[PDB]
Design a protein around this ligand. Structure first.
Ligand SMILES: CNC(=O)c1cc(Oc2ccc(NC(=O)Nc3ccc(Cl)c(C(F)(F)F)c3)cc2)ccn1
Ligand SMILES: CNC(=O)c1cc(Oc2ccc(NC(=O)Nc3ccc(Cl)c(C(F)(F)F)c3)cc2)ccn1
Ligand SMILES: [Cl-]
Lengths: 264, 264
Protein backbone atom coordinates (compact mmCIF):
# COMPACT_ATOMS: atom_id res chain seq x y z
CA UNK A 1 0.00 0.00 0.00
CA UNK A 2 1.15 3.54 0.81
CA UNK A 3 3.37 4.09 3.84
CA UNK A 4 4.43 7.65 3.12
CA UNK A 5 3.96 10.07 6.00
CA UNK A 6 2.81 13.58 5.06
CA UNK A 7 5.43 16.14 6.03
CA UNK A 8 4.78 18.27 9.09
CA UNK A 9 3.36 15.27 10.95
CA UNK A 10 6.52 13.87 12.48
CA UNK A 11 8.00 15.73 15.43
CA UNK A 12 11.73 15.05 15.55
CA UNK A 13 13.00 15.33 19.11
CA UNK A 14 16.21 14.41 20.92
CA UNK A 15 19.11 13.00 18.88
CA UNK A 16 19.95 9.38 19.68
CA UNK A 17 22.84 8.60 17.38
CA UNK A 18 24.87 9.97 14.50
CA UNK A 19 26.79 7.89 12.01
CA UNK A 20 28.80 8.03 8.83
CA UNK A 21 25.55 7.58 6.87
CA UNK A 22 22.43 8.94 8.56
CA UNK A 23 21.22 10.08 11.97
CA UNK A 24 18.63 8.77 14.40
CA UNK A 25 16.36 10.89 16.56
CA UNK A 26 13.62 9.99 19.02
CA UNK A 27 10.46 11.44 17.55
CA UNK A 28 6.73 11.80 17.92
CA UNK A 29 4.08 10.49 15.56
CA UNK A 30 1.08 8.90 17.25
CA UNK A 31 3.19 8.16 20.28
CA UNK A 32 6.95 7.69 20.63
CA UNK A 33 8.69 6.68 17.42
CA UNK A 34 12.20 6.63 16.04
CA UNK A 35 13.27 8.57 12.97
CA UNK A 36 16.35 7.82 10.87
CA UNK A 37 17.26 10.38 8.21
CA UNK A 38 20.26 10.91 5.92
CA UNK A 39 20.60 14.54 7.02
CA UNK A 40 22.61 15.04 3.82
CA UNK A 41 20.48 17.56 1.91
CA UNK A 42 21.98 16.07 -1.28
CA UNK A 43 20.32 12.69 -2.03
CA UNK A 44 23.23 10.72 -3.53
CA UNK A 45 22.25 8.53 -6.50
CA UNK A 46 23.33 5.68 -4.22
CA UNK A 47 21.85 7.07 -1.03
CA UNK A 48 18.36 7.34 -2.54
CA UNK A 49 18.94 3.78 -3.68
CA UNK A 50 19.76 2.43 -0.23
CA UNK A 51 16.75 4.27 1.14
CA UNK A 52 14.50 2.38 -1.28
CA UNK A 53 16.18 -0.85 -0.24
CA UNK A 54 15.76 -0.42 3.53
CA UNK A 55 12.16 0.69 3.18
CA UNK A 56 11.41 -2.04 0.67
CA UNK A 57 12.70 -4.60 3.17
CA UNK A 58 11.01 -3.21 6.28
CA UNK A 59 7.58 -3.00 4.65
CA UNK A 60 7.92 -6.74 3.95
CA UNK A 61 8.14 -7.50 7.66
CA UNK A 62 5.41 -7.97 10.23
CA UNK A 63 6.66 -9.94 13.20
CA UNK A 64 6.80 -9.26 16.93
CA UNK A 65 10.49 -10.00 16.86
CA UNK A 66 11.34 -7.59 14.05
CA UNK A 67 11.52 -3.85 14.64
CA UNK A 68 8.13 -2.43 13.60
CA UNK A 69 8.28 -0.26 10.50
CA UNK A 70 5.79 2.64 10.90
CA UNK A 71 6.38 4.40 7.58
CA UNK A 72 8.80 6.43 5.49
CA UNK A 73 8.99 10.06 4.48
CA UNK A 74 10.45 11.27 1.18
CA UNK A 75 9.13 14.74 2.00
CA UNK A 76 11.68 17.40 3.12
CA UNK A 77 14.63 15.04 3.65
CA UNK A 78 14.48 11.23 3.42
CA UNK A 79 13.58 9.46 6.64
CA UNK A 80 12.42 6.11 8.03
CA UNK A 81 10.00 5.85 10.96
CA UNK A 82 9.95 2.79 13.23
CA UNK A 83 8.43 2.03 16.60
CA UNK A 84 10.43 3.38 19.51
CA UNK A 85 12.09 0.63 21.53
CA UNK A 86 12.50 1.31 25.21
CA UNK A 87 15.59 -0.33 26.66
CA UNK A 88 19.09 -1.20 25.47
CA UNK A 89 20.60 -3.48 22.86
CA UNK A 90 21.75 -6.95 23.87
CA UNK A 91 25.26 -5.71 23.19
CA UNK A 92 24.85 -2.85 25.65
CA UNK A 93 23.41 -5.15 28.32
CA UNK A 94 26.14 -7.72 27.97
CA UNK A 95 29.32 -5.75 27.49
CA UNK A 96 28.63 -2.25 28.62
CA UNK A 97 26.37 -2.25 31.68
CA UNK A 98 27.15 -5.94 32.18
CA UNK A 99 23.70 -7.21 33.08
CA UNK A 100 23.48 -10.67 34.57
CA UNK A 101 20.52 -12.47 33.02
CA UNK A 102 19.28 -15.82 34.24
CA UNK A 103 19.84 -18.92 32.17
CA UNK A 104 16.10 -19.03 31.43
CA UNK A 105 16.19 -15.42 30.26
CA UNK A 106 19.26 -15.97 28.07
CA UNK A 107 17.72 -19.03 26.45
CA UNK A 108 14.58 -17.00 25.94
CA UNK A 109 16.45 -14.17 24.26
CA UNK A 110 18.01 -16.76 21.97
CA UNK A 111 14.64 -18.28 21.07
CA UNK A 112 13.20 -14.91 20.21
CA UNK A 113 16.14 -13.88 18.06
CA UNK A 114 15.93 -17.25 16.34
CA UNK A 115 12.18 -16.76 15.81
CA UNK A 116 12.88 -13.38 14.28
CA UNK A 117 15.63 -14.62 11.98
CA UNK A 118 13.51 -17.59 10.97
CA UNK A 119 10.88 -15.09 9.85
CA UNK A 120 13.26 -12.86 7.88
CA UNK A 121 14.71 -15.87 6.07
CA UNK A 122 11.22 -17.17 5.24
CA UNK A 123 10.59 -13.81 3.56
CA UNK A 124 13.83 -14.45 1.64
CA UNK A 125 15.66 -11.70 3.52
CA UNK A 126 19.28 -11.95 4.56
CA UNK A 127 20.30 -9.65 7.39
CA UNK A 128 24.03 -9.62 6.63
CA UNK A 129 24.86 -7.84 9.86
CA UNK A 130 23.09 -9.64 12.63
CA UNK A 131 24.92 -8.88 15.88
CA UNK A 132 24.17 -8.23 19.55
CA UNK A 133 24.24 -4.59 18.72
CA UNK A 134 21.23 -5.08 16.41
CA UNK A 135 19.30 -7.22 18.90
CA UNK A 136 17.21 -4.86 21.01
CA UNK A 137 15.67 -5.95 24.32
CA UNK A 138 12.47 -3.92 24.23
CA UNK A 139 11.06 -3.37 27.72
CA UNK A 140 13.74 -5.78 28.96
CA UNK A 141 11.39 -8.42 27.51
CA UNK A 142 10.84 -9.29 23.81
CA UNK A 143 13.61 -9.14 21.24
CA UNK A 144 13.52 -6.72 18.35
CA UNK A 145 15.87 -7.39 15.45
CA UNK A 146 16.79 -4.60 13.06
CA UNK A 147 19.74 -2.64 11.68
CA UNK A 148 20.76 0.00 14.23
CA UNK A 149 23.97 0.68 12.34
CA UNK A 150 24.78 4.14 11.00
CA UNK A 151 28.44 3.68 10.05
CA UNK A 152 27.67 1.42 7.07
CA UNK A 153 25.26 2.06 4.17
CA UNK A 154 34.84 1.05 5.48
CA UNK A 155 33.45 -0.04 8.88
CA UNK A 156 32.75 -3.69 9.59
CA UNK A 157 31.53 -6.02 12.29
CA UNK A 158 34.25 -8.63 11.85
CA UNK A 159 33.38 -10.58 15.01
CA UNK A 160 30.09 -11.83 13.58
CA UNK A 161 31.34 -12.57 10.06
CA UNK A 162 31.51 -16.14 8.88
CA UNK A 163 34.86 -17.27 7.41
CA UNK A 164 33.62 -17.36 3.83
CA UNK A 165 32.51 -13.76 4.28
CA UNK A 166 35.69 -12.57 5.95
CA UNK A 167 37.54 -14.02 3.00
CA UNK A 168 35.83 -13.31 -0.29
CA UNK A 169 33.85 -15.68 -2.43
CA UNK A 170 32.23 -14.78 -5.75
CA UNK A 171 30.39 -11.44 -5.30
CA UNK A 172 27.80 -12.55 -2.72
CA UNK A 173 29.34 -14.63 0.11
CA UNK A 174 26.16 -14.00 2.11
CA UNK A 175 23.53 -16.63 2.68
CA UNK A 176 21.12 -18.05 5.22
CA UNK A 177 24.14 -19.89 6.61
CA UNK A 178 26.18 -16.68 6.93
CA UNK A 179 23.41 -15.31 9.18
CA UNK A 180 23.36 -18.53 11.18
CA UNK A 181 27.07 -17.96 11.85
CA UNK A 182 26.47 -14.45 13.14
CA UNK A 183 23.66 -15.92 15.26
CA UNK A 184 26.30 -18.36 16.52
CA UNK A 185 28.42 -15.44 17.65
CA UNK A 186 25.40 -13.94 19.40
CA UNK A 187 24.87 -17.20 21.33
CA UNK A 188 28.52 -16.98 22.28
CA UNK A 189 27.91 -13.53 23.82
CA UNK A 190 24.79 -14.64 25.67
CA UNK A 191 26.59 -17.67 27.05
CA UNK A 192 29.94 -16.06 27.90
CA UNK A 193 28.85 -12.49 28.40
CA UNK A 194 31.90 -11.50 26.34
CA UNK A 195 32.92 -10.63 22.76
CA UNK A 196 35.05 -13.09 20.75
CA UNK A 197 38.85 -12.84 20.55
CA UNK A 198 39.01 -10.43 23.48
CA UNK A 199 42.65 -11.37 23.99
CA UNK A 200 43.75 -10.30 20.50
CA UNK A 201 44.27 -6.60 19.79
CA UNK A 202 44.82 -6.69 16.05
CA UNK A 203 41.92 -6.48 13.63
CA UNK A 204 43.96 -7.50 10.62
CA UNK A 205 45.18 -10.58 12.46
CA UNK A 206 41.68 -11.59 13.54
CA UNK A 207 40.44 -11.05 10.00
CA UNK A 208 43.22 -13.12 8.48
CA UNK A 209 43.19 -15.93 11.05
CA UNK A 210 39.41 -16.35 11.20
CA UNK A 211 39.33 -16.44 7.41
CA UNK A 212 41.85 -19.27 7.26
CA UNK A 213 40.25 -21.26 10.06
CA UNK A 214 43.19 -20.69 12.42
CA UNK A 215 41.05 -18.75 14.90
CA UNK A 216 37.59 -19.61 16.27
CA UNK A 217 35.50 -18.60 19.31
CA UNK A 218 36.71 -20.14 22.57
CA UNK A 219 33.70 -22.22 23.60
CA UNK A 220 35.26 -23.18 26.93
CA UNK A 221 34.14 -19.82 28.27
CA UNK A 222 30.44 -20.60 28.31
CA UNK A 223 28.79 -20.19 31.73
CA UNK A 224 28.88 -23.33 33.89
CA UNK A 225 25.08 -23.39 34.03
CA UNK A 226 24.84 -23.35 30.23
CA UNK A 227 22.89 -26.44 29.02
CA UNK A 228 24.76 -28.93 26.84
CA UNK A 229 22.13 -28.74 24.13
CA UNK A 230 22.94 -25.03 23.90
CA UNK A 231 26.71 -25.27 23.87
CA UNK A 232 26.25 -27.80 21.10
CA UNK A 233 23.75 -25.74 19.14
CA UNK A 234 26.31 -22.97 19.31
CA UNK A 235 29.22 -25.01 17.96
CA UNK A 236 27.01 -26.14 15.08
CA UNK A 237 26.21 -22.59 14.07
CA UNK A 238 29.82 -21.50 14.21
CA UNK A 239 31.00 -24.33 11.96
CA UNK A 240 33.76 -22.97 9.73
CA UNK A 241 32.17 -24.74 6.79
CA UNK A 242 29.15 -22.87 5.46
CA UNK A 243 27.26 -26.00 4.40
CA UNK A 244 27.68 -27.74 7.77
CA UNK A 245 25.68 -24.97 9.48
CA UNK A 246 21.99 -25.59 10.29
CA UNK A 247 19.13 -23.34 9.20
CA UNK A 248 16.90 -21.47 11.63
CA UNK A 249 13.86 -23.74 11.44
CA UNK A 250 16.06 -26.43 12.99
CA UNK A 251 17.83 -23.99 15.30
CA UNK A 252 14.51 -22.82 16.66
CA UNK A 253 13.23 -26.31 17.46
CA UNK A 254 16.54 -27.12 19.07
CA UNK A 255 16.16 -24.13 21.39
CA UNK A 256 12.47 -24.53 22.11
CA UNK A 257 13.22 -28.13 22.96
CA UNK A 258 15.92 -27.53 25.56
CA UNK A 259 13.70 -24.68 26.70
CA UNK A 260 10.84 -26.92 27.79
CA UNK A 261 13.05 -29.12 29.96
CA UNK A 262 14.79 -26.23 31.68
CA UNK A 263 12.68 -24.53 34.42
CA UNK A 264 13.25 -27.55 36.70
CA UNK B 1 2.56 -5.99 -1.28
CA UNK B 2 1.49 -9.59 -0.64
CA UNK B 3 0.52 -11.02 2.73
CA UNK B 4 -1.21 -14.23 1.77
CA UNK B 5 0.11 -17.18 3.74
CA UNK B 6 0.62 -20.41 1.76
CA UNK B 7 -1.64 -23.15 3.09
CA UNK B 8 -0.06 -25.87 5.20
CA UNK B 9 2.11 -23.29 6.97
CA UNK B 10 -0.21 -22.30 9.80
CA UNK B 11 -0.64 -24.77 12.64
CA UNK B 12 -4.03 -24.18 14.25
CA UNK B 13 -3.95 -25.23 17.90
CA UNK B 14 -6.23 -24.76 20.89
CA UNK B 15 -9.57 -23.00 20.37
CA UNK B 16 -9.85 -19.64 22.13
CA UNK B 17 -13.31 -18.45 21.24
CA UNK B 18 -16.30 -19.22 19.09
CA UNK B 19 -18.79 -16.75 17.72
CA UNK B 20 -21.89 -16.33 15.58
CA UNK B 21 -19.55 -15.38 12.71
CA UNK B 22 -16.06 -16.91 12.94
CA UNK B 23 -13.85 -18.74 15.43
CA UNK B 24 -10.48 -17.92 16.97
CA UNK B 25 -7.71 -20.41 17.68
CA UNK B 26 -4.23 -20.00 19.12
CA UNK B 27 -1.91 -21.04 16.32
CA UNK B 28 1.68 -21.41 15.24
CA UNK B 29 3.38 -19.59 12.39
CA UNK B 30 6.85 -18.33 13.15
CA UNK B 31 6.04 -18.30 16.82
CA UNK B 32 2.70 -17.99 18.62
CA UNK B 33 0.00 -16.35 16.52
CA UNK B 34 -3.77 -16.07 16.56
CA UNK B 35 -5.99 -17.34 13.77
CA UNK B 36 -9.55 -16.21 13.11
CA UNK B 37 -11.52 -18.16 10.51
CA UNK B 38 -15.16 -18.26 9.43
CA UNK B 39 -15.31 -22.05 9.83
CA UNK B 40 -18.35 -21.90 7.54
CA UNK B 41 -17.21 -23.93 4.52
CA UNK B 42 -19.67 -21.83 2.47
CA UNK B 43 -18.19 -18.33 1.86
CA UNK B 44 -21.31 -16.14 1.95
CA UNK B 45 -21.33 -13.37 -0.67
CA UNK B 46 -21.35 -11.06 2.37
CA UNK B 47 -18.91 -13.08 4.46
CA UNK B 48 -16.22 -12.95 1.76
CA UNK B 49 -16.94 -9.25 1.64
CA UNK B 50 -16.40 -8.67 5.37
CA UNK B 51 -13.20 -10.71 5.13
CA UNK B 52 -11.86 -8.32 2.50
CA UNK B 53 -12.86 -5.40 4.71
CA UNK B 54 -11.14 -6.61 7.88
CA UNK B 55 -7.98 -7.56 6.04
CA UNK B 56 -8.02 -4.35 4.04
CA UNK B 57 -8.16 -2.41 7.30
CA UNK B 58 -5.56 -4.38 9.24
CA UNK B 59 -2.96 -4.18 6.46
CA UNK B 60 -3.30 -0.39 6.70
CA UNK B 61 -2.13 -0.42 10.30
CA UNK B 62 1.37 -0.46 11.74
CA UNK B 63 1.38 0.83 15.30
CA UNK B 64 2.56 -0.64 18.59
CA UNK B 65 -0.86 0.03 20.03
CA UNK B 66 -2.82 -1.72 17.29
CA UNK B 67 -3.00 -5.51 17.14
CA UNK B 68 -0.30 -6.63 14.69
CA UNK B 69 -1.68 -8.11 11.48
CA UNK B 70 0.61 -10.98 10.35
CA UNK B 71 -1.24 -12.00 7.20
CA UNK B 72 -4.36 -13.60 5.75
CA UNK B 73 -5.12 -16.94 4.17
CA UNK B 74 -7.75 -17.45 1.47
CA UNK B 75 -6.44 -21.00 1.04
CA UNK B 76 -8.57 -23.87 2.47
CA UNK B 77 -10.99 -21.73 4.49
CA UNK B 78 -10.69 -17.96 4.98
CA UNK B 79 -8.60 -16.87 7.95
CA UNK B 80 -6.80 -13.88 9.45
CA UNK B 81 -3.48 -14.20 11.29
CA UNK B 82 -2.44 -11.68 13.96
CA UNK B 83 0.23 -11.62 16.62
CA UNK B 84 -0.68 -13.59 19.73
CA UNK B 85 -1.34 -11.35 22.72
CA UNK B 86 -0.44 -12.79 26.08
CA UNK B 87 -2.68 -11.55 28.88
CA UNK B 88 -6.31 -10.49 29.23
CA UNK B 89 -8.52 -7.75 27.87
CA UNK B 90 -9.02 -4.58 29.90
CA UNK B 91 -12.61 -5.70 30.33
CA UNK B 92 -11.54 -9.00 31.83
CA UNK B 93 -9.08 -7.30 34.19
CA UNK B 94 -11.58 -4.74 35.39
CA UNK B 95 -14.85 -6.61 35.74
CA UNK B 96 -14.02 -10.28 35.78
CA UNK B 97 -10.81 -10.88 37.74
CA UNK B 98 -11.12 -7.39 39.22
CA UNK B 99 -7.51 -6.28 39.04
CA UNK B 100 -6.56 -3.20 41.01
CA UNK B 101 -4.25 -1.07 38.88
CA UNK B 102 -2.44 1.96 40.21
CA UNK B 103 -3.52 5.42 39.15
CA UNK B 104 -0.30 5.75 37.13
CA UNK B 105 -1.02 2.46 35.37
CA UNK B 106 -4.64 3.41 34.62
CA UNK B 107 -3.58 6.75 33.20
CA UNK B 108 -0.97 4.93 31.19
CA UNK B 109 -3.49 2.48 29.77
CA UNK B 110 -5.61 5.46 28.77
CA UNK B 111 -2.70 7.18 27.04
CA UNK B 112 -1.87 4.10 25.04
CA UNK B 113 -5.45 3.49 23.95
CA UNK B 114 -5.65 7.15 22.99
CA UNK B 115 -2.40 6.84 21.05
CA UNK B 116 -3.80 3.85 19.23
CA UNK B 117 -7.13 5.51 18.38
CA UNK B 118 -5.33 8.65 17.30
CA UNK B 119 -3.44 6.48 14.82
CA UNK B 120 -6.50 4.69 13.45
CA UNK B 121 -8.31 7.98 12.93
CA UNK B 122 -5.28 9.47 11.17
CA UNK B 123 -5.51 6.55 8.75
CA UNK B 124 -9.17 7.53 8.29
CA UNK B 125 -10.37 4.41 10.12
CA UNK B 126 -13.35 4.37 12.44
CA UNK B 127 -13.42 1.52 14.93
CA UNK B 128 -17.17 1.60 15.58
CA UNK B 129 -16.90 -0.83 18.45
CA UNK B 130 -14.14 0.39 20.70
CA UNK B 131 -14.72 -1.07 24.17
CA UNK B 132 -12.74 -2.45 27.10
CA UNK B 133 -13.33 -5.85 25.65
CA UNK B 134 -11.34 -4.83 22.55
CA UNK B 135 -8.51 -3.24 24.53
CA UNK B 136 -5.96 -5.95 25.22
CA UNK B 137 -3.26 -5.55 27.90
CA UNK B 138 -0.40 -7.42 26.29
CA UNK B 139 1.75 -8.83 29.12
CA UNK B 140 -0.16 -6.63 31.56
CA UNK B 141 1.80 -3.78 29.95
CA UNK B 142 1.19 -2.34 26.42
CA UNK B 143 -2.25 -1.75 24.99
CA UNK B 144 -3.36 -3.53 21.84
CA UNK B 145 -6.54 -2.29 20.19
CA UNK B 146 -8.43 -4.54 17.80
CA UNK B 147 -11.79 -6.22 17.21
CA UNK B 148 -11.99 -9.34 19.37
CA UNK B 149 -15.70 -9.67 18.69
CA UNK B 150 -17.15 -12.78 17.06
CA UNK B 151 -20.89 -12.39 17.75
CA UNK B 152 -21.46 -9.78 15.00
CA UNK B 153 -20.13 -9.93 11.38
CA UNK B 154 -28.24 -8.93 17.06
CA UNK B 155 -25.81 -8.61 20.01
CA UNK B 156 -24.52 -5.16 20.99
CA UNK B 157 -22.24 -3.39 23.44
CA UNK B 158 -24.70 -0.65 24.39
CA UNK B 159 -22.71 0.78 27.27
CA UNK B 160 -20.13 2.26 24.91
CA UNK B 161 -22.56 3.61 22.30
CA UNK B 162 -22.91 7.33 21.88
CA UNK B 163 -26.48 8.71 22.03
CA UNK B 164 -26.68 9.44 18.31
CA UNK B 165 -25.75 5.82 17.69
CA UNK B 166 -28.15 4.36 20.26
CA UNK B 167 -30.95 6.24 18.55
CA UNK B 168 -30.86 5.81 14.75
CA UNK B 169 -29.61 8.77 12.77
CA UNK B 170 -29.26 8.53 9.01
CA UNK B 171 -27.66 5.27 7.85
CA UNK B 172 -24.16 5.87 9.29
CA UNK B 173 -24.34 7.39 12.82
CA UNK B 174 -20.70 6.41 13.33
CA UNK B 175 -17.87 8.90 13.26
CA UNK B 176 -14.59 9.85 14.86
CA UNK B 177 -16.72 11.41 17.60
CA UNK B 178 -18.71 8.20 18.15
CA UNK B 179 -15.38 6.44 18.90
CA UNK B 180 -14.37 9.26 21.22
CA UNK B 181 -17.56 8.59 23.16
CA UNK B 182 -16.77 4.92 23.53
CA UNK B 183 -13.28 5.97 24.62
CA UNK B 184 -15.05 8.16 27.18
CA UNK B 185 -16.80 5.09 28.56
CA UNK B 186 -13.46 3.29 28.74
CA UNK B 187 -12.00 6.15 30.81
CA UNK B 188 -15.02 5.78 33.04
CA UNK B 189 -14.12 2.11 33.65
CA UNK B 190 -10.45 2.85 34.31
CA UNK B 191 -11.40 5.61 36.73
CA UNK B 192 -14.27 3.88 38.53
CA UNK B 193 -13.34 0.28 38.02
CA UNK B 194 -17.00 -0.31 37.15
CA UNK B 195 -19.35 -0.53 34.15
CA UNK B 196 -21.90 2.27 33.56
CA UNK B 197 -25.50 2.06 34.79
CA UNK B 198 -24.72 -0.83 37.13
CA UNK B 199 -27.83 0.01 39.12
CA UNK B 200 -30.24 -0.41 36.21
CA UNK B 201 -31.25 -3.93 35.17
CA UNK B 202 -33.16 -3.18 31.99
CA UNK B 203 -31.40 -2.98 28.65
CA UNK B 204 -34.35 -1.43 26.87
CA UNK B 205 -34.55 1.27 29.51
CA UNK B 206 -30.86 2.06 29.29
CA UNK B 207 -31.08 2.15 25.52
CA UNK B 208 -34.08 4.47 25.54
CA UNK B 209 -32.86 6.76 28.31
CA UNK B 210 -29.31 7.15 27.05
CA UNK B 211 -30.65 7.91 23.61
CA UNK B 212 -32.83 10.73 24.89
CA UNK B 213 -30.16 12.19 27.15
CA UNK B 214 -32.03 11.22 30.32
CA UNK B 215 -29.25 8.87 31.44
CA UNK B 216 -25.49 9.48 31.50
CA UNK B 217 -22.48 7.93 33.29
CA UNK B 218 -22.25 8.88 36.98
CA UNK B 219 -18.92 10.72 37.09
CA UNK B 220 -19.03 11.08 40.87
CA UNK B 221 -17.73 7.53 41.10
CA UNK B 222 -14.25 8.27 39.84
CA UNK B 223 -11.47 7.26 42.25
CA UNK B 224 -10.51 9.96 44.76
CA UNK B 225 -6.94 9.99 43.44
CA UNK B 226 -8.17 10.63 39.88
CA UNK B 227 -6.60 13.88 38.54
CA UNK B 228 -8.98 16.72 37.67
CA UNK B 229 -7.59 17.00 34.16
CA UNK B 230 -8.69 13.40 33.67
CA UNK B 231 -12.16 13.65 35.14
CA UNK B 232 -12.62 16.63 32.85
CA UNK B 233 -11.19 14.94 29.77
CA UNK B 234 -13.68 12.20 30.47
CA UNK B 235 -16.72 14.46 30.70
CA UNK B 236 -15.71 16.06 27.41
CA UNK B 237 -15.60 12.73 25.61
CA UNK B 238 -18.96 11.67 26.96
CA UNK B 239 -20.71 14.85 25.82
CA UNK B 240 -24.18 13.90 24.63
CA UNK B 241 -23.71 16.16 21.64
CA UNK B 242 -21.55 14.56 18.95
CA UNK B 243 -20.00 17.83 17.78
CA UNK B 244 -18.98 18.94 21.28
CA UNK B 245 -16.68 15.90 21.63
CA UNK B 246 -12.93 16.35 21.03
CA UNK B 247 -10.86 14.34 18.57
CA UNK B 248 -8.02 12.06 19.61
CA UNK B 249 -5.12 14.31 18.65
CA UNK B 250 -6.38 16.68 21.34
CA UNK B 251 -7.31 13.89 23.72
CA UNK B 252 -3.80 12.48 23.48
CA UNK B 253 -2.08 15.77 24.28
CA UNK B 254 -4.46 16.30 27.16
CA UNK B 255 -3.45 12.93 28.63
CA UNK B 256 0.26 13.18 27.93
CA UNK B 257 0.15 16.58 29.57
CA UNK B 258 -1.40 15.53 32.88
CA UNK B 259 0.87 12.53 32.60
CA UNK B 260 4.09 14.52 32.84
CA UNK B 261 2.96 16.22 36.03
CA UNK B 262 1.83 13.14 37.92
CA UNK B 263 4.65 10.88 39.33
CA UNK B 264 5.57 13.29 42.16
C1 LIG C 1 16.11 3.72 22.98
N1 LIG C 1 16.31 2.79 21.92
C2 LIG C 1 16.42 3.46 20.61
O1 LIG C 1 17.59 3.96 20.43
C3 LIG C 1 15.62 3.00 19.33
C4 LIG C 1 16.13 3.33 18.14
C5 LIG C 1 15.56 2.99 16.98
O2 LIG C 1 16.29 3.46 15.90
C6 LIG C 1 16.24 2.79 14.71
C7 LIG C 1 15.47 3.32 13.68
C8 LIG C 1 15.39 2.70 12.44
C9 LIG C 1 16.14 1.47 12.22
N2 LIG C 1 16.14 0.76 10.80
C10 LIG C 1 16.31 -0.61 10.64
O3 LIG C 1 15.87 -1.30 11.50
N3 LIG C 1 16.27 -1.36 9.31
C11 LIG C 1 16.46 -2.62 8.71
C12 LIG C 1 17.26 -2.78 7.58
C13 LIG C 1 17.43 -4.02 7.05
C14 LIG C 1 16.80 -5.12 7.63
CL1 LIG C 1 17.11 -6.69 6.84
C15 LIG C 1 15.97 -4.96 8.81
C16 LIG C 1 15.31 -6.02 9.44
F1 LIG C 1 16.20 -6.94 9.81
F2 LIG C 1 14.64 -5.68 10.53
F3 LIG C 1 14.42 -6.55 8.62
C17 LIG C 1 15.83 -3.70 9.30
C18 LIG C 1 16.92 0.93 13.27
C19 LIG C 1 16.96 1.59 14.51
C20 LIG C 1 14.31 2.23 16.95
C21 LIG C 1 13.76 1.86 18.17
N4 LIG C 1 14.43 2.26 19.38
C1 LIG D 1 -4.57 -14.60 24.71
N1 LIG D 1 -5.52 -13.66 24.19
C2 LIG D 1 -6.02 -14.05 22.85
O1 LIG D 1 -7.21 -14.50 22.91
C3 LIG D 1 -5.63 -13.34 21.51
C4 LIG D 1 -6.52 -13.44 20.52
C5 LIG D 1 -6.34 -12.89 19.31
O2 LIG D 1 -7.43 -13.15 18.45
C6 LIG D 1 -7.74 -12.25 17.46
C7 LIG D 1 -7.51 -12.60 16.13
C8 LIG D 1 -7.83 -11.71 15.11
C9 LIG D 1 -8.41 -10.41 15.45
N2 LIG D 1 -8.85 -9.38 14.34
C10 LIG D 1 -9.10 -8.00 14.59
O3 LIG D 1 -8.64 -7.48 15.58
N3 LIG D 1 -9.47 -6.95 13.52
C11 LIG D 1 -9.85 -5.61 13.32
C12 LIG D 1 -10.98 -5.25 12.59
C13 LIG D 1 -11.30 -3.92 12.46
C14 LIG D 1 -10.49 -2.95 13.06
CL1 LIG D 1 -10.99 -1.24 12.85
C15 LIG D 1 -9.32 -3.34 13.82
C16 LIG D 1 -8.46 -2.45 14.45
F1 LIG D 1 -9.17 -1.76 15.35
F2 LIG D 1 -7.46 -3.03 15.12
F3 LIG D 1 -7.91 -1.62 13.58
C17 LIG D 1 -9.05 -4.67 13.91
C18 LIG D 1 -8.63 -10.10 16.80
C19 LIG D 1 -8.29 -11.01 17.78
C20 LIG D 1 -5.12 -12.11 19.01
C21 LIG D 1 -4.17 -11.98 20.02
N4 LIG D 1 -4.43 -12.61 21.31
CL1 LIG E 1 2.06 -3.60 5.04
Amino acid sequence: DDWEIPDGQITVGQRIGSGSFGTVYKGKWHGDVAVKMLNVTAPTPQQLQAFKNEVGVLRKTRHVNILLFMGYSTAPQLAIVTQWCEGSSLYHHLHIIETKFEMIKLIDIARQTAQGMDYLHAKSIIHRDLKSNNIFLHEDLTVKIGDFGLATVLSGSILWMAPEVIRMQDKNPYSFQSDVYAFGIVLYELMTGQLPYSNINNRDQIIFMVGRGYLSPDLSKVRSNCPKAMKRLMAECLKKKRDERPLFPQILASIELLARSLPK
